């Protein structure tokens, strides 16, 4: 009875398709977990700079998010967002770098608005180690730092973090990779 045979093959095909997708999503979940940090410090490694720069220039992929990082095991959940070809007043001329508060499982227990000092950095891979960076005290009246209602608050940071020329002509890029670092002050709490 081939109709029966075909129906079962079809069910199996569909279930194999679902499993193949769950498997790929778990691979992603592993990477996220393996690169998580719980002391308020993020190191974000961005490979294939050239291709990714070009995808932002072409408007295919304007921005990238880091993996999440945390101020503590059950603390604020955060990430970074970078625009390789720049955003706002830095579009086309700069790399723009922003900080992001994400909805965390424990937000009901944490102080809001978010008020930890944040430091944004681009790492120098040259032997001089002249890292680019700046820090800010979050503005309490910015919606960037409100208790999250959606998955992610609006990003906040530096549209003109570094000129693209400075970036590309220095020692920040090596083996077609850059390293971004974010430091959130945690000494303040709990």
């Amino acid at each position: 009875n081939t109709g029966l045979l075909e129906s079962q093959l079809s069910r199996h095909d569909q279930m194999l398709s679902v499993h193949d997708i769950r498997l790929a999503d778990m691979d992603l979940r592993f990477q996220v977990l393996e690169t998580a940090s719980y002391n308020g410090v993020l190191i974000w490694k961005i490979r294939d700079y050239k291709r990714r720069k070009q995808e932002a220039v072409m408007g295919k992929t304007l921005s990238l998010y880091s993996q999440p990082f945390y101020t503590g095991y059950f603390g604020y959940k955060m990430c970074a967002r970078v625009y390789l070809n720049g955003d706002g007043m830095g579009k086309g001329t700069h790399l723009s770098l922003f900080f992001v508060i994400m909805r965390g499982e424990y937000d009901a227990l944490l102080p809001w608005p978010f008020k930890q000092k944040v430091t944004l950095m681009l790492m120098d891979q040259g032997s001089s180690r002249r890292h680019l960076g700046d820090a800010f005290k979050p503005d309490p009246n910015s919606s960037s730092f409100k208790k999250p209602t959606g998955e992610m608050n609006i990003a906040s940071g530096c549209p003109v973090f570094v000129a693209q020329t400075v970036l590309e002509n220095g020692t920040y890029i090596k083996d077609d990779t850059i390293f971004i670092k974010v430091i959130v002050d945690t000494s303040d709490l709990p």
Binding site: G88, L132, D134, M152, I154, S156, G157, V160, F161
Partner: peptide, 14 residues
């Protein structure tokens, strides 16, 4: 380094 005034990126989260 020219970030004396931290501002939001242009619009959209998620």
């Amino acid at each position: 380094p020219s970030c004396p005034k931290p501002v939001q990126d242009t619009q959209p989260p998620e």
